[PDB]
Amino acid sequence: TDPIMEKLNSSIAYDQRLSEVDIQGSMAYAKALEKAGILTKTELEKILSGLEKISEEWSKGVFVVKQSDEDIHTANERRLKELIGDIAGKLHTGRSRNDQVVTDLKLFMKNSLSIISTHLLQLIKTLVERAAIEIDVILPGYTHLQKAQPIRWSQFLLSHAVALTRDSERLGEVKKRINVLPLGSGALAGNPLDIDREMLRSELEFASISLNSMDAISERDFVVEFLSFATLLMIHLSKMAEDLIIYSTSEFGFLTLSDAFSTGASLMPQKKNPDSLELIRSKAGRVFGRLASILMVLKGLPSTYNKDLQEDKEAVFDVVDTLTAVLQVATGVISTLQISKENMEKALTPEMLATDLALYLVRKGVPFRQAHTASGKAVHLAETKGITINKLSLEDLKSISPQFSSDVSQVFNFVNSVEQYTALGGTAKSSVTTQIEQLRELMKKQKE
Amino acid sequence: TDPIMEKLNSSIAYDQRLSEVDIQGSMAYAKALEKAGILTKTELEKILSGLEKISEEWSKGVFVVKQSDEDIHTANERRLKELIGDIAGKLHTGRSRNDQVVTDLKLFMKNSLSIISTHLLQLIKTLVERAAIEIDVILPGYTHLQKAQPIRWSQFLLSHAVALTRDSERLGEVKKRINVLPLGSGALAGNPLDIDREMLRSELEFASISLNSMDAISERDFVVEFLSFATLLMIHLSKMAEDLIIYSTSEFGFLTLSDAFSTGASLMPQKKNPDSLELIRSKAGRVFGRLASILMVLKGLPSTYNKDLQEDKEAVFDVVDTLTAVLQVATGVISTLQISKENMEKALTPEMLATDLALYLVRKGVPFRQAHTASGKAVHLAETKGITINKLSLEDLKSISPQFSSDVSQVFNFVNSVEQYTALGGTAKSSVTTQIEQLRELMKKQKEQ
Amino acid sequence: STDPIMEKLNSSIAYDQRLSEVDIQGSMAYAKALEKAGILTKTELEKILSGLEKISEEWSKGVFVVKQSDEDIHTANERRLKELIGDIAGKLHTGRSRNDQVVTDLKLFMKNSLSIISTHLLQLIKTLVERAAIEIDVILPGYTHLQKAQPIRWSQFLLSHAVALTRDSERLGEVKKRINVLPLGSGALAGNPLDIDREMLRSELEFASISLNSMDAISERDFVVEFLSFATLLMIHLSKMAEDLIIYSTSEFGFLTLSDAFSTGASLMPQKKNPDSLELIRSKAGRVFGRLASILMVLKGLPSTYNKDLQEDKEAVFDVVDTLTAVLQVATGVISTLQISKENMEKALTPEMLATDLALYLVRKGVPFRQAHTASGKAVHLAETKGITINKLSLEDLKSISPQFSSDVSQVFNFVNSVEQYTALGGTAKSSVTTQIEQLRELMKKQKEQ
Amino acid sequence: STDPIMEKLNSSIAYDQRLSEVDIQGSMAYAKALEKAGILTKTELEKILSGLEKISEEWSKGVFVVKQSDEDIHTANERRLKELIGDIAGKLHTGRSRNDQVVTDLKLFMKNSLSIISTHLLQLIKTLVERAAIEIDVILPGYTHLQKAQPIRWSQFLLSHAVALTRDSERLGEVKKRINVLPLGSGALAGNPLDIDREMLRSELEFASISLNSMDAISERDFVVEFLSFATLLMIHLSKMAEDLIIYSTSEFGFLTLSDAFSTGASLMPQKKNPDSLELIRSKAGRVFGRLASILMVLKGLPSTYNKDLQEDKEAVFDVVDTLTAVLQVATGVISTLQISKENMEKALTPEMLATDLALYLVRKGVPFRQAHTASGKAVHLAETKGITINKLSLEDLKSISPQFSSDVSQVFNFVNSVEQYTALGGTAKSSVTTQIEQLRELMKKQK
């Protein structure tokens, strides 16, 4: 026996995290075994009693792993034998580590996903609640990281909330396919003892049962799917982080993170580094790496079970802990950051209203092309005079288009600017208000 | 201006494919602009007529792209001006290339997903039909690419069909989020003219409208998703390809692909190369590469629109054409390959029944650990006598365990072996029939949706 | 029988046509080799080489007509040859396989492309170095966590990107080395069966050496993968420079303005310039990485030797070669034509950024690290309480904090003095920047030669 | 003003403590440079070096106690140093940053690791080449599309993998050289402010040269990326070799059997061995590639200079270093102890595989390529008709097809003669194989 081979093959170091679900799966299997008459009533009692002790050992942190333990399945089996004797061996009857390992992982994932959902909905709720409070705040909207047009700060917050809501929906879709029992698939051909799979389903609380035994022990669709959901969520978080890091620069000055989510030097007490957001942004790569690895692991693999499949667990574990930490830090950052209403409003410039000046002519019937040419001229005329467009005289304006009336004065108002956007989904207050309502309802349906 | 910059920035070369959907998007927008008062009834008639003429030029292949057209959106508006004059310019009022391009890509992807769905469901149907017909065929089931135990050829075919059915379910989920109208989001803050977005939705036949203008124009979730669906689908096909390429070796000898899906030489007329399956398997890399690229493009990008987002189209086009081609070739391969029932059956060996021999004792009350011990003794006994286990004598077996009775001869039958797995999902004939029924019911639902 | 979708998917002619000229060059060399092996006559050789020339010429002019039967470039070029000189043409492929012919084609193509990519990369690096030399006096904030950390020379910023790009150039040279090995003569997988003169082929095609093992030479796509790895790391460097430049071009930072040629805008906001050029560059990091990811997946788990899977290499190489070629030139245009705002870079320098220098001032007078740092922190607090900035504290103010503070301390509050502290090799001190420029010109020279 | 999730997420101590020793070496070299600069007196230096050595030993003995306040390995070492020698410890970080300290620690560790990896890699290559020498007489089928194409020597196959591995070894040397550049003395980003003697730090730490630009030296992770690229392409090679051997080990091919140490089996089927070793190896290509993917995404689009995002480099490097070390050794074991079936390999050789040589026979006689080819096809065609193998055709039968067929055609139908055709450099002919073995031995020598 080669020690390097043994260490490489062995999965106990990390798969012991599945200790509890593994016992849960065995208890369920033991009850079906009895029903199938493989075990006597008394034998069942003994088995279940022993399994409960083991759950407790792991639970209290007293379980002692042994050098011989290849995986969590062998470890639990070894300890039950130690606790109740020979009778423990009837438990693996008609059972394979192949369907046992995917049953364990799916039960762990269903529980993990339930937790991730709570944190994801909390992040969304936090953004939506903040959008509701700061709905009167206006700042520049950007394209190419250049000032485009005024937008409400809440529109920006809600843009991230909406995208995250789609991540929550995908999470639900992933959870559905994970909530399918694979136990009773045996090594690849199914269970040979006509085990009551419906009974196993009910006991382990799965929603339905796997359709084909070969597919059940061979596929890791649920792992890839979860990693795809995870990666896109991180993409969203990498973008929100990017936005917030830039807005927190001294140059932008739109906001400041709380002390808990930033770092800084006593020599420059006014400066705060957004470490929280940089950690979050870098995890998009950490999680994407996991998705890439499993995809490459599964590609070109022959049916059915192959040891290549063992690489699934460490990837799922890393991403579950990554998502759980990242979502809570994101929530914290969003709920505690402080905005500078003053600097956001200060960033609004008259130049950003030339588009609105053109729209003014459009609403009066001037064709789009000529309205844009007119505004461009007003902008040019102001520039030649060394003044801003909101300062041009009505006479100056008419020298370019008699269509400009004294009411053109209303164009140079940033509230009036964002208020143009009443069509559904836009930045006008009535629209932002509607979005908050839709999101509250969406979160409700998702939580449910 | 810099020529190389202009070439790199211009998207006309490929976004040309969006010609029809772009025209369809402008027609719906034109209709809403008229209802909004930006266009007169007559102007709307002139614009829709001109737009219809451009649609025909593209379909007929006579559209003339000018050196000045930077993108499909520009080419179409230029042409509309050539056709109807000045009024053509009012078309873009309140619209932006930002909400126009994602509307175009979504309309295009919605149509492509319908076509892909059709070929995906056809592949699944083909595998299911063959499993129904060849339901008596039995062969080795593998683990570590080593013979593990008997299974029905149909169980193998259905394992691939079940996976593909999950792919079809994901396709639907992706299609749902793609079927959301982004038009009327403007450059980023919304449409400034109170365009009737419900009307645009109904005209373009989208299921609902986008919730937030900034997100509608900035996100490419729908591209990523589609690419994740495509990639997992390809993973499944590369696995089925791996299986069939191996099963097609002369060493395995289980099956032979038709001439249409293989290649060969006259010097060796009996040898066939599965080029079709190798093309398919390598397309998993091709598709995954598009997924990785778009994810990297979006990572770390600030809000809202950035030119980085232009990389979406070539990746979507490639994957759509890869899937449509790959799915039809896969269906072809599955329906036209020829299996060797004789070699598949010859592949089944006695050695593969030692587990069964152990279950035989188990079903008689013998504890798992000791039934396996007894079956082991049996194997060794036959081993030291130069004979296969099914040739071991009744008294021989008895010397090992008295619980071995005359009825043990039924263990040495491969049909009885697979018939052990009647538990839902197993390889027993009844289970296979149930699966066929389940998938058919599943396909019915996915199709009526 | 034949399936239209299958033959369409298997056919590579639509893209492998690009290898037309190099496919013909490899045939001219193999022909010459066949003649030496005694397979062709001196008379035939002249015929064949004469026909290949016409073919080679037809592609060059753009008059070659591909036919429905042409499944790939190898088949197309042969078809036309037979059409040009007759049955004698059919002897050219004697002992040759599409297996060793296609890899020979791709490497010759990549050798030429890499030489072109080298020129562009070296020009980008030279652009950054020469600009650094000219603007060596410009000082602006150095950033960490995108927060102002400390004064640095703008040329130090330019050279940081130049140095990274230099390592990309070095990698390109290593990749080209392995690409510059002849695979022709490996046959289908067991080698050339006619005892062809591989050295003659090497010489004729101008490869540096020949492949050591037939199976490997036929199935490996290492040269494609590392070309792609090199391309991907190069794009990463460019994505970072793009990010910096995009942020520095914001009106918030106001450090620089791209030229109109490499940006977009509207007459409605004439002063605003969108950095489309840099955005295209940043996004191509994804595009190129996607190619590396695809080929690695195509090769993973493949059995020996040739398999049709390998056909996916060509489209990935073509895309990346064309992407780098366009991207590097656009990058060079961006760097050489952008305008910096010395005024704004200078205005971003604040007294608060010298608190670390203030501590260092004490460290050089023997004050321990902890005490000096504490001392500076106290000055920062005193300044704030007094309603001023640290460069405004009086000597008495400073002495009340530490006895080591002497009148010369006023020299700390000078940004040139600040960057001039970093004379240790690699720092932002003017002499260090000068040295780097000289080292980079040297490196470019040696790489240029290599 | 502190958040437990944020703290846990931000600290790197859990994993960067692996850099405990090289961190100490970096501190010792720095301390010496400081003494030379005059920042430390010789006496202070002797006390600092003495404390650093004790910390080095504590880690060596697994006695080092990490405290909850330890954010990273740099912080934990500085804390303990002060506990051991008092205030004097504070002068050590003078003019230094964790920014140039961490990359120095990572390059030192990676240089040591690449040294170990090269040894195992060179040993894997040697294993293949020496086996090829010994089994040089063995012949078996060569495959294209996994279909029998033409006879080749077993040694040609083995050497094909050795040659690819040899390029991996070359890339490793290239990567090591760029890793062997000292970044210490770069400070936070602008360089070292105390005119520290970098050439001295270089000599003490044994780097080949020193970094050229402080910002780049602190910001770049090229060294991490290209080492992950080297590792990923190396894993691709191993995945390819694993695929070949897993297939050759099938009952269906019967070409070889793995030893018990690197295989797994079933008790009811003692003659069957599962190549778990090779599957673990194949799957690791995905695991390593995942690491490559993650770091690329982490770096993509990041602004200069240091960002907390860069913290993700370490876990990826450690995982891959440990993966290659184990994988290379297992691969060596599998190749060294596996047993081939000369009988089965020769058995797989068939007359059908010689039609090609028959055509070559005519071309050497002077028959134009296409004629020789068409003639060979007629030969196989007629053999089939008469329902006999091609080696059974009478010279008469052959002459009717082509006048150029002489009695010596009998030479074509021999497998050794078949492989012997390939004497051109690189071919499978015994002489060509011998030349390869010699070339590879010299290569391995030079790569040292």
Ligand SMILES: N/C(=N\CCC[C@H](N)C(=O)O)NC(CC(=O)O)C(=O)O
């Ligand atoms: N070892 C095994 N399955 C192990 C599952 C748990 C494993 N650690 C994993 O994570 O995949 N199975 C087989 C083959 C079986 O598939 O028939 C064998 O005994 O070699």
Ligand SMILES: N/C(=N\CCC[C@H](N)C(=O)O)NC(CC(=O)O)C(=O)O
């Ligand atoms: N050009 C543009 N979006 C173009 C979309 C179509 C493009 N080919 C793509 O594929 O993304 N937008 C802006 C900035 C706007 O976003 O405010 C501009 O005019 O510079």
Ligand SMILES: N/C(=N\CCC[C@H](N)C(=O)O)NC(CC(=O)O)C(=O)O
């Ligand atoms: N099809 C082939 N080589 C094709 C090379 C060019 C191809 N378009 C590619 O790009 O890989 N070879 C074989 C098998 C040979 O590998 O022995 C055959 O069909 O006979």
Ligand SMILES: N/C(=N\CCC[C@H](N)C(=O)O)NC(CC(=O)O)C(=O)O
């Ligand atoms: N935290 C930091 N460097 C940390 C290095 C080690 C870290 N665990 C990593 O792995 O990147 N730097 C700064 C900013 C400095 O870069 O100016 C700070 O003190 O906030």
